[PDB]
Amino acid sequence: SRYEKWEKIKQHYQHWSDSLSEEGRGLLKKLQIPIEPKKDDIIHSLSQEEKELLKRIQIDSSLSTEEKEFLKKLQIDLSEKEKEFLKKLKLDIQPYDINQRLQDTGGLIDSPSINLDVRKQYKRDIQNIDALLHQSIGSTLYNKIYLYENMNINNLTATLGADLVDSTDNTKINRGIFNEFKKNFKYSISSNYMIVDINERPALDNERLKWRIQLSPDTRAGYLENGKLILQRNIGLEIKDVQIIKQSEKEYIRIDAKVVPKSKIDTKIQEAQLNINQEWNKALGLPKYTKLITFNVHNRYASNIVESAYLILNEWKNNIQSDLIKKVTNYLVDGNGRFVFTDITLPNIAEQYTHQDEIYEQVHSKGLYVPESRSILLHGPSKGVELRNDSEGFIHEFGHAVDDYAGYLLDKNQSDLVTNSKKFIDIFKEEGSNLTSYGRTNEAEFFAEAFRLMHSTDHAERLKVQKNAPKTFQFINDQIKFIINS
Ligand SMILES: Cc1cc(S(=O)(=O)N(CC(C)C)[C@@H](C(=O)NO)C(C)C)ccc1F
Ligand SMILES: [Zn+2]
Numbered sequence: 475s476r477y478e479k480w481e482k483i484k485q486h487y488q489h490w491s492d493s494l495s496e497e498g499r500g501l502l503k504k505l506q507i508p509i510e511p512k513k514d515d516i517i518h519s520l521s522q523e524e525k526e527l528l529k530r531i532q533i534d535s536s537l538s539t540e541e542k543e544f545l546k547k548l549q550i551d552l553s554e555k556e557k558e559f560l561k562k563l564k565l566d567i568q569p570y571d572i573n574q575r576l577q578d579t580g581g582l583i584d585s586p587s588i589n590l591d592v593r594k595q596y597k598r599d600i601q602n603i604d605a606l607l608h609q610s611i612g613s614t615l616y617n618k619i620y621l622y623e624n625m626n627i628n629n630l631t632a633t634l635g636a637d638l639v640d641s642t643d644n645t646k647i648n649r650g651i652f653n654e655f656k657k658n659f660k661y662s663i664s665s666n667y668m669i670v671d672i673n674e675r676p677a678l679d680n681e682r683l684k685w686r687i688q689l690s691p692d693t694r695a696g697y698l699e700n701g702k703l704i705l706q707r708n709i710g711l712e713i714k715d716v717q718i719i720k721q722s723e724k725e726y727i728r729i730d731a732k733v734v735p736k737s738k739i740d741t742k743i744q745e746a747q748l749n750i751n752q753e754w755n756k757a758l759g760l761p762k763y764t765k766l767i768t769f770n771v772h773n774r775y776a777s778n779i780v781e782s783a784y785l786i787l788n789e790w791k792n793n794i795q796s797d798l799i800k801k802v803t804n805y806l807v808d809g810n811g812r813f814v815f816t817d818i819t820l821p822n823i824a825e826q827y828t829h830q831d832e833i834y835e836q837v838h839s840k841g842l843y844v845p846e847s848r849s850i851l852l853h854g855p856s857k858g859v860e861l862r863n864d865s866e867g868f869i870h871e872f873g874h875a876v877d878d879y880a881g882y883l884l885d886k887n888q889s890d891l892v893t894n895s896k897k898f899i900d901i902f903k904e905e906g907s908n909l910t911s912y913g914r915t916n917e918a919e920f921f922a923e924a925f926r927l928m929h930s931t932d933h934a935e936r937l938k939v940q941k942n943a944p945k946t947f948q949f950i951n952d953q954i955k956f957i958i959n960s
Pocket of ligand 2 (some may be wrong): 843870874918919922950
């Protein structure tokens with residue numbers, strides 16, 4: 475029975491439940507219900523000058539959907555002063571969310587991406603919760619019960635989430651896309667505390683993923699009221715089957731998964747990382763043991779992050795001249811650079827935060843190039859600006875590395891980016907608004923966008939650059955030939 479199964483699991487944890495202190499209970503509640511910031515408290519902290527800016531800021535021009543929405547709620551009550559202001563206010567509007575801190579950091583909670591005092595608070599709570607979850611599901615119950623988790627598609631990757639629901643009929647799933655999603659999804663990792671239902675729960679808004687999970691005998695867990703279980707963090711899941719199913723006259727994605735030791739999955743990730751480095755060290759003429767490609771993977775869409783990297787690098791190789799690729803990559807390797815493919819947020823990537831002490835200067839986005847570490851960083855799960863796919867965004871980031879190397883060759887001592895040279899600056903104030911909306915941001919991003927579009931698979935997109943921005947077009951080709959001939 476649905477009910478009998480519930481009472482049985484509750485009984486198994488009954489002693490554990492009664493044994494909880496009020497402090498333990500409050501901790502579990504805080505984990506389930508994050509402490510939101512009070513808009514009252516925020517606005518009261520702002521000066522008079524400041525208060526006014528928020529109302530005048532066009533907020534949707536940047537920040538994440540949640541943050542821009544919350545700020546709008548404050549509004550009723552970008553210039554260089556406007557970005558710097560938001561970059562600081564962003565630090566004050568974050569909810570205290572234990573599961574989110576664990577997900578964002580992939581469990582590396584010492585990452586200096588948040589205020590030291592709050593960082594330690596998260597750490598204490600996490601360590602105490604780990605201590606609460608000490609009783610395993612056991613050898614009797616584990617193969618007699620299923621546990622369930624409804625999930626938003628956008629949580630794994632917001633790229634597929636955009637068009638995975640059939641645009642024609644929203645009650646059905648896009649078959650082709652589903653087949654790709656299914657073929658690259660073989661294993662999953664939970665770095666935070668999964669909160670699962672004992673009995674399957676009817677889907678709510680944007681819950682088209684319905685996980686069915688079998689635990690292992692030694693999977694630690696704790697009963698939560700109203701028929702739920704909290705599972706220990708740091709577990710692995712093997713994807714046993716992905717199917718399209720029909721529930722109450724509508725289609726969903728069944729995900730069957732079995733809990734396995736996380737270390738077993740990390741083994742597969744490190745093997746894959748070893749493999750992809752072997753293949754590309756050869757193809758690029760690098761020393762066999764060069765560490766170039768990093769899989770920084772800790773979350774629920776783990777395997778696709780790995781598989782996506784292979785395709786991204788392949789597109790990168792198919793659309794950019796071999797000599798340019800070899801020249802620039804060797805330069806990055808000379809600076810111990812990396813191609814980092816990850817599902818944790820970029821402020822928690824060492825190749826960024828090592829060179830950025832100020833948290834308000836740390837950036838989370840779909841992609842980044844960090845000159846100080848000669849590294850390209852690509853975040854799988856998130857959505858890009860305006861961008862067709864991750865392959866193109868990678869080419870964009872590689873554009874930044876191209877900018878980097880070109881300016882270096884110009885002046886090997888006190889190196890700079892060519893987009894800081896007087897020639898491109900003037901080119902930019904002329905042709906800076908002739909390409910993508912994001913190309914307008916600055917010289918660097920304009921260069922990178924132009925570089926990207928000049929290497930698009932679509933013919934039309936590369937002539938556009940040659941058409942709408944011929945000076946930029948020629949300038950880039952000049953840098954390319956200059957680099958190759960170096
Ligand atoms: C799709 C995708 C999206 C981005 S992005 O984060 O939106 N982006 C701009 C983007 C047009 C290329 C970032 C960027 O410039 N990185 O260096 C900005 C937001 C700092 C990065 C990689 C990608 F593959
Ligand atoms: Zn960029």
